[model samples]
Target chain A: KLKAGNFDVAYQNPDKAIKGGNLKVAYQSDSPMKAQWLSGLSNDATFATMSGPGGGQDGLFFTDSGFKFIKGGAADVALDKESKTATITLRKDLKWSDGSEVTAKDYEFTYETIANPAYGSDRWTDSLANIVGLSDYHTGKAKTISGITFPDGENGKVIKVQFKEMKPGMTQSGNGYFLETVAPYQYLKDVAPKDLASSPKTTTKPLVTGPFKPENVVAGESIKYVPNPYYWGEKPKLNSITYEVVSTAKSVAALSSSKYDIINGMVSSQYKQVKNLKGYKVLGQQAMYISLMYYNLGHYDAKNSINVQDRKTPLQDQNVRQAIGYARNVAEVDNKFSNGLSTPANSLIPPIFKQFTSSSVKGYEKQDLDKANKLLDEDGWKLNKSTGYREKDGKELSLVYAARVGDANAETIAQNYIQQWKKIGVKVSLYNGKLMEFNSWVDHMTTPPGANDWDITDGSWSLASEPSQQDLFSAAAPYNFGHFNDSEITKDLNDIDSAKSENPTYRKAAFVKYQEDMNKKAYVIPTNFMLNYTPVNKRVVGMTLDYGAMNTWSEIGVSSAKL
Target chain B: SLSQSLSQS
Candidate 1:
């Protein structure tokens, strides 16, 4: 066993079992972990370390497996309609993996710890911002909410947490999320809390209600975990699980050599090698992740000129940005680079998660050279006599496009775009740089006149199932990093998130508006999503497919036969 | 010749 309570997981597919042997698994990067309270939505890097058993992460490792309305770990969840409050009842049988009963005091401690000014954690503070008396309680102005109460007879089993109004995002995610789960109040009561974002590691032991915990973590090498007998859920079938970190090439080679029973982190390159392996099962899985590019809008000049202005206004002109957007051929990008395994996208949200995706949003999905030329011509951008570039107001419309050096496909696509723009008499030059150096070039992607040597740009963003509008809406969030914060887009993005809008209609409406406005404003162009997924070996059994996010950990188990 | 010209280089 890796630890007394926690199991180090096999890097192999969780549902598959090796024949009479232990599975050696590997991963590409360091595993992420975070405290239960912030584990759900926190952007902390450690969140990666805490991916749950069977390859799930955070509270999702537990909640996604069950259909129960109320969650338990030292707490019973009940909704009170009249008061608009959620009452948590601590389970009598609930105890930490370390043998301590989960308590209400633990619950209170985690909330207060997040609010303490000294301990800075960015995760879910905004969600907590709406809680009544939370600001007061954080600053020591209030002791408790009059709306929340504990019945005198029920000591640990019951604590009523009240909300002034029902929040849509919290309503969907809160129960299963560790923000609602109780922490070890007794251990953390005396110790000073630290900034989770910076020194995220907790010296005090983490108390878990889930089935597995960490035993031996060899950083960048391996981690081992064992099952928690005190787990509130059904007992796990495996004796132990060990996650062995292997490179993409090594994992495939090991799997073929029978060194590992199963493997995770299946990249496209690995798939090409393993597609024909006998007795190996391959099925594509869905995920909550997206791959896209973003332009840095703040580093640009005020005007759309490239040279006249002292600084860069890279994507300043809506016409130029629109022209470049129209220049991209989604069919070409997908077929040549993505192997025709992805869906051509017009919005940030993918097609599978239709909740916030809109077919109605205006994005450049097809080539429109005619419309592109019209936009440039109408804007008084005439062909420059000497440079053969477009110009208006005695200023040249020369733009420098950038792509990372080693990325053959992206660079190829950028060059093809330059050739396309030349038809319109735009003098755009291409600059090549290393991947890391491209960050400096992107610093001015959204500025009207570019700064940092870039003019026209390309980037994409992945959307989360429960997307927060703070980055897309709030000027305060760096995610609005594109520096083009349109109020209309903000209003549309906020409508679905702010309300209980999980229903298909409200989510659809919100996405339609957000995409339409974002497209009209020329903030960023949408590209296609890669649908490349390969399933676990058929020998491994008992995995349930829930849409396409890679959250199949809790319900996964080893079955004797292949699928 | 005309038929081949439109279809191929």
Candidate 2:
């Protein structure tokens, strides 16, 4: 059924795929992309669709749907916890776009670039910090990361990383504990880290070891790709692939007119316009995404990137936060706006992470006004006739919400949220008395974590393959904007990656403990798990939702360039 | 704190 992946079918005309034709793709975004190619310095997720597994970039390892490393990729990874190291050996056939063999040096170069603050990158995180001596390199206390060593010497293919502690997810792709993608060391060694962002090598013609290499970039508008002449994997099928930035509203028109063979970010909002066409097949899947509400529970210490709990807001109380979670009715928003494209998220670890998603922990999925008001009463918040709102110590349960300015639907959704909170005797008002622009809203929510003017905020995240939340939810996480600090949560999060978790049973048990505790505490409430819907002209083929690569982008082709 | 041990120390 379509509900299986929220789509009618995975492939419409599979046999129609031809050998060589330019696949035109429309990537929808509200703004032009920053267009950073190197994944180490760039936060842009779009670039991965290009160089990552499905992309033409050289990948070190190929993972199964379960994220386990399988042989026959560019490299084989051997993880030894007793020795506290991960040894990666690249296949001899691997070659960059520039015809240079991929070696340990390229891997080391990327790690060094990310660790060295002189480059001014914020990509370093708790998971990567597990590497022995990495912090010393990042802080300039050491000349190099002593943790990384090429057992076969720097010029050879074998590279090993020494971790301070063994990570349970070390063997999985997107573990965030090592450099999976590498920078071409020979090509990039001459470029200064500070200048790399604006340099042509970064945004235009960067060398990579993927199926395709950057052929041309028209800056913010479109990027054209050609199969790498020296790629190690199967030769890319299409002669060329062009990815163009198409506005959200114009996605349907772009697909209908044969301007694009595929539109990647088609939302449920445009289902009607998409239905207005005939030649395209809609592909959908439960995305690795979570749109959540965060209660302000603490501030971030910038110097150390640590969460420090101040507990100033009304949401700091466990019961109050839990009550708010029960009070929220996300299904209404999903049904009215999402066009069957989203479900109210039940756990922080989505059901996609089948093994790790807690079976027992069902988060606040439906509205429970009775439970909400009862919890409030138990928390010493009594109703007051004077203010018509619950009062504790002569103070009304007034809250300031930090919301971003979005389309008309977002405004209605936010208003509905405010009205729902008010019904439970909580006075919720928009920050600055109006919605903030995207840039301003982000700054307010993430920066000055302890001193932000708002008491609550919203966030959305597409999770990594490893299903670990160290960088997204840990005490030292900069993205932990909610600043909910629990000494126990830190331990629980660390356990997921700790040595004890190396045993599958213990790691899953650790996930349940963390999920249960976090749900009970309700620091950040999971609201919705949005589904990914894409529209492709019936001619485009070889599409898949499998974990590693979309059936390897190199094999993708089209019956006709414009049909 | 781990922060004290990890970065600033």
Candidate 3:
């Protein structure tokens, strides 16, 4: 409910919900899907369209907008701070699509499959190691993660988890320390740990505890689903659901032609063409998304699990970084390019996290040419007489940036950014003299330094429900694309997650200090927070993009199967 | 890790 929606929801549409009808959903993507339905194995964020609570693999906890655990989810949690443990009691009514009861073994199996190195899932992260004895289990020093226990036997619904040290975020979903969703241990138990992701159980015919079960999957093109017979909730309204891959460019055309009941992940650049379309209701909500402006001042030392500032680059100068931040016309891009769907953000923490977001620290969102010039001048980056660009010592201030492919205004946007920074006397060029493909760009920016020849980068990420940005910003995080490790930031992150941060007031204040330190460096500038809009046909009902919205797929239905 | 959107362009 973040101030968006064309028609009145919950009222203007059909009130009693549509009867059994086929629902046609268009998943906007430049590429096809892999049908990797398992959360642990899936690589793309688009997997959400077919596999979350909206599909068959709902998470264990129900969280409010703030991500705090609510009472209505499938499981109830009781924490014992003295023992540093949490006990989860699953609802007895829950059952898998295979008709077996959802039990503690399924939860324990998820941790075992992910945390174990032999399994080889990228989901194994630094924060998940916080659970007590998980490190021992992952390292093969122990047979089991002594931290996880099925107190009422593996077949029972009760599971207990042990933590080494308790933090304030432990009570919330997406806290980065525990598993919320589950895999069917009974089905996946026989599959080899390394083979699970590739197995048909994970990719093709996975069992779900959700409203619908997937069938007729066409590798990467489309998937069809029917109601899960064992769903514990209300009966599904739709007869069947078909998710088709719609290329972003042609999605608007397909929608206007009445070929789809709904469109997911529509780009804002398409807004002008779609805003006034007949028989459609464009619904928008503030997203947990942020487009990044990360400068490559350093590289990550993967073996040590830390970002090291061993390499020196043109962006090393703090003033030069701040100069570039002030040089970009972020608002114009969001206002005009995004059709006012995005807002230029001042801090990394988007406005949705009202409790901890800091306001005093001003980031370089407002474009200022004079300040850019002054900062370059102060940093001794003098404008070269012959080239018409800035210089430091005798070397040219040329930088290589890696911009992603397939954005709206695709070709012009990268050049547009480069064109702006050039005006500030800092000449930035695309990596390999061209914008890289998404997968190729990710490899260059993150994984191997296979010609990791880049100085600046562009990328986007959706925040987890919880407030701790530990996974994205921490030094140990592999996702720290900027790869800059400063003590001020390191200490600030530590303090924010420290035992003392258990006090809500102390944690709140720690966030301000973390932001103050972050703004001081300007190494990573969050350009904008994008709003996600889903265009639902006037005939469709029960679809939304609100924060904490449980868009149960069973609840979605259309007035008729026709256009 | 956070969920990454594929809009690299």
Candidate 4:
């Protein structure tokens, strides 16, 4: 095939060329880190890559070799200089594999259907609460606006998609789906709501617009793909691509034999063994994700009712939140898990990126048990004899900490917290459940205004590389999982999104205020930001692995390599 | 107290 086409490869016989061959790729994780998200290429085995954080969906698009915008997905993009709104127009020639014209309605529903509370899209609401009208629609208080619509002028094939109102942050979450290589709409729509994640493999044909198409999907074992002749761009050179799922042990063996061309870079422990391998390369990406624990601030009153909340949460008192901050040992945990490869995160934002700034509320980096215990005493929580905990005004100072089940590291960290909290006369209980169940309990409020269950839980959230983080702390996001809300944080988040000042100093000041307010409330117990890694086979060429977002198959390519 | 805090958060 190589000699037949312009492509040629040789070993000893320079004139003679080898025929085409297949490439098998391997992934370290099971599914899209969050199936709830619509974008990114880690899961579907083809299509979709990320633009940078906070950049509108089309701003930082990537192909296999590097970042480049695609047509049917994103063509003409309009940015409102004043409102910070980004408008994307899909080229009409862009048709789904099923030959159906992908409409503006598809892009609209991606944000509207989920944001419109009635659809109850778990993924959209949690991430995109910052979009204009999204919060109100989530509560059924507002109607879907006609703001984002197709202009009908670009031949018969263009769909002009506009944001309802401009907010810099709205672009990332709403369009995160662009990073996802495949669109599950046609296959999964009839069975499930348009905004919800579809069942795995039931509709595996993948009616997508990407360059690759799924050839085989053997449940839990592997999936295979081949280039789509109908793809709008340059076709991939590889004859076929395969993603084989193997246990951590089998993955190493597969890598050694070069069965799969890529693997996640090993920690110090595994790196020591693999550094000697002849054909392997280690790659590092700056961490893009952050894991933090949020404290529930909604108060339940003396009447024992959930919403008639009485003595306000101690976290409402900023001093107390900062005091608890002093007890956390980020350095110890990062050293243990990341082989000292990770950074200790004092500020809520990761420091490597331009967005990370020092918080207004700084805590003692040193573990100050005396300071922690003193804060508890000063807060009027007296010692309780029954369980060796503290109580104030007849309420015992005890909390329930929950995390996703099967995360042994989280469990271990929780135990460490329990030991520390106990020393301060705080009784903390561990409530472990499956991931969804824990999320459900967080917002399963019996009344429209009350929390369902949980006080403190171990979790993390993504702050889109772009700026719209206001919705995470907004009153509109009832599913905030942990029932913490504040108008101050909400105001700051909104300012970051809707800032009118182009002055860098003005924008910097507003964002700093937002970060400080969030830290002051101790809305979340800040943990370290994510550190990302990818390992590539020497044969893989012309690909750029970004450090901000996790690795995706859509951004990788294969090149000629002979042993 | 656990019940109360869980209810509030």
Candidate 5:
């Protein structure tokens, strides 16, 4: 039996849990499951499906009920206050799925690989870079990361990471999921660090230290996982788990037909139908994802000093952007479509961080056609007599709005926007017949106006525990699709990053000031903070709603799930 | 062995 701290067991009655059965699961995409590889590199839906507290992706320190970082199911963490160093000691019994013992060298290997420039890791952004010599290592100034060291030489059981400064946020632990997982150094030592991503070890059969090991991957169809013999903690109750690839549109039908024991990411419109099913639990809770409509603010040609001549429409104006914001009726969209499960979002900061967001900064929550029209009129987009659409400088007010096809809620919301904006004399065309598939839509959103297509897009950003918006809003941030460049906003974001170690009041004040300023600009119009709808067969026990997507299906055991 | 020590603890 598993003890609480040894790997915090979420199971209620250990003795009552049925020891063995196949826990059948399904995902919407046919994406590859990069088993025991860096999840950051892959768009694999099965990667997230496979990882949890029992998985290799589990963090050294896990969060408590109040989201406080505490020693839990994985490795034990010791922090030195004076030296500003974190010493992480993996469980001695921890062994890889291949029966090899896990050591500190694996941790060092992960840090080293991430620091390698050729790997193209996003870990350079603030969090991991806060480590003392990580930036230097990334820049090729040092062969090895000086920040990460094994006191008892390279193969020691304890790995110590030295941070530049101590912060209150630093003490706050990961929400079960690890930012960087320990890759098997012994297994991948032969493969070059740069080639590790596509190496056979990563792509095919990488050694895992999780509760279950990949038995076989059937390319685009399904991945079969069996209990890891070398798993140190209490063995997983399920004998096997198979993540099958099913279309998102067909997920409800599949679940209803009992083709899958569990299904998540279901459309909100199908909630009533799904909830009425006997011997099943349909759970819906507010998710930590915010959906929004982004305006393509054109690209900045550095050193060219090019004038803003590429502006095809009036959306380049702040007033026009604000007008678009006012036109979106988020409350109606939530009630009509999502069954009032979603909260109307106002700021980039998610509502979960209530202390940081300012209530005074009111974003475009209400649909005010009068305000929208007035703003458009003020912005020189007067009604064109001939076309019935608003015109500015002989150009008609037109927009190409793009959204992902597979997302039912996104498609519904986009339709609503199209209808509402039409009343205000703005011509809106759906990108490639209403909505494109997930990958195609992402390409359009990330691509600049000069090279990429589409004028506006409806997208959502999933956030981390750290309340840093610099990555999303910063001038150089790749995800900043709109190219939103504001010196004041950058300065405010920088202040928030620097004030992490300071008192809560000081950091909260900094964030409040930032949001207030950001709201005034109305860069990206906020829609709704989403809610997740997950349905599981009644036999599955120990399933709970997790904001981090940390502890869920993986921790739960099969009771009488269909084999 | 470390595994034995951890399990014993």
Candidate 6:
């Protein structure tokens, strides 16, 4: 038995079951490696550290069998519904990479940093808003969050966090997953929270609590990590873990040449190329990462407001949105574009989360031009003989669909969509460009040239372990890209969140209703629920599929690796 | 072609 914080974890292996070796992994895209302190701020770094020791979600260790959270992280969590609080007990033995003790104040500092307005992480703020006094503190109305308190006093190992209300699935805290992994407050305390992203401490070498500390970084190129002598948990099996940014163009050559030991985020297009390669294993798994289309129905346009000619978007009509959904041949896209790697999803909630997902939303799997055109017809949109496009009054049935360029499958799907939409008397103009540029368009779509900038943009959402739609559908949420504001959807989701009922059947019914309400509005056209492919060298023994996105690198050990 | 998932920590 191994002790992790206030819990004990059992494993069959002794201290040295898996020994040391150098492990090299590759990522296709160029990701920022500077903001190491912003583990809560960026997913790029978050995924980068998935295999790196001292960097993980909640700092909690998972069992190799099922990736189950068996305990022994930086802290232990216990919820108190009566008091609407979660009490955290930091591991007294917890020590940072610098050999400094981790305490309750460190977690409090992490919370405050996340709540700071200058931090510019709306996602973190939104997820942690349930913590009492966080809103007031975040808005600058309060000096500090009143809910975060040290029960055993200021520097004690115990902390009590009060929530605004008892949220559904309070035990897990809906994605924050109940209590945060502590950050090194002493090391980061001197740096301004606003400047944390660029602080030398963050980019150079931030203090960590895991088994390894970042040993070297090559900016946009690669990062190498070595064993942290002060780690509190079981020692890691690898001597060093290195993540290299090898472009997709060079990935196959790199793997085949044995320059890279493992490569993740493998696209289906490349699956066949690597499947038969000697000393390599091609693995596929399902996950909640889903790709979808977001319609600019209620997109806010501050500049063109009130006086603009096309102020009202065509997607403002529910029928038009539904027609677009019908026009999408998701199964065909899955087959032709993704090489049968993705599943055609019909609901906002992915099918993996069996209890919450509803397959009731119909007519999305296959293309139905007749149904699409009929819906347009019944909604007062008539075919314009001269233009060959549908029109209602003086408005044309035309839309600018946006998506990132460079992905072969996405381009294929987008082209297919354009053809299908054209057949139904709708004109679609494709705005394909860089991923970052496309993100900027989606992010600023609520501003001046918002609705005019684009009518639809390719979008996706990764569902957490907990199956809640609060962030995706909430009007107040920053991630609610299309500004989809349906009162019934909002109310049903609210009911699901606020409902005290613990009955699984009752909760399922609530989710069904919530999905039905969302479907009626047709704000989002469900597309592919992603299934990832990863190629691992035969030398990697412990690599296993985790949620279909990437290999569970944390559990991975190197049996034999060259260089 | 992956869009950022806001839910991932």
- The estimated TM-scores of all candidates read 0.71, 0.90, 0.91, 0.73, 0.84, 0.86
lDDT of model 6 at residue B2? 16
Candidate 1 local distance difference test against the native = 0.48
User: DockQ: which is higher, 2 or 3?
Assistant: 3
Is model 2 an incorrect, acceptable, medium or high docking prediction?
incorrect
lDDT of 3 by residue, A437-516 (tens): 76566556556322347877877765676777777777766677777788888788778877899998999889988877
Q: Give the alpha-carbon lDDT of every model.
A: 0.48, 0.73, 0.74, 0.47, 0.63, 0.63
**Interface RMSD, one decimal, each candidate:** 24.2, 13.1, 3.7, 15.5, 17.1, 7.7
Top candidate (TM-score): 3
Fnat per model, in the order given?
A: 0.00, 0.00, 0.28, 0.00, 0.00, 0.15
Question: By TM-score, is 1 or 4 better?
Answer: 4
Name the top lDDT candidate.
3
Clashes per model (N, Cα, C within 3 A): 57, 7, 3, 15, 2, 1
The reply for model 3, stretches above 4 Å from the true place, is A1-12, A53-57, A301-303, A446-451, A548-551, B1-9
Q: How well is candidate 6 docked (DockQ)?
A: 0.16
The digit string of per-residue lDDT tens for model 2 on A211-318 reads 777788887687777887787778877888888777666777787688987776556667667865788777766666667788887788766657888867778788
Candidate 5 scores an fnat of 0.00
Ordered by DockQ, highest first, the candidates read 3, 6, 2, 4, 5, 1
Task: Chain A only: list TM-scores of all candidates.
Answer: 0.71, 0.91, 0.91, 0.74, 0.85, 0.86
On the 0 to 100 scale, the lDDT of residue A440 in model 1 is 41
**Candidate 6 clashing pairs, residues 3+ apart or interchain:** A4-A72
> In terms of lDDT, which candidate is stronger, 2 or 3?
3
Clashing pairs in 2: A50-A55, A56-A210, A56-A211, A56-A212, A57-A210, A58-A209, A58-A210
| DockQ computed for model 1 against the true two-chain complex using alpha carbons | 0.01
Quote model 6's iRMS.
7.7
Instruction: Report the candidate with higher TM-score, 1 versus 3.
Output: 3
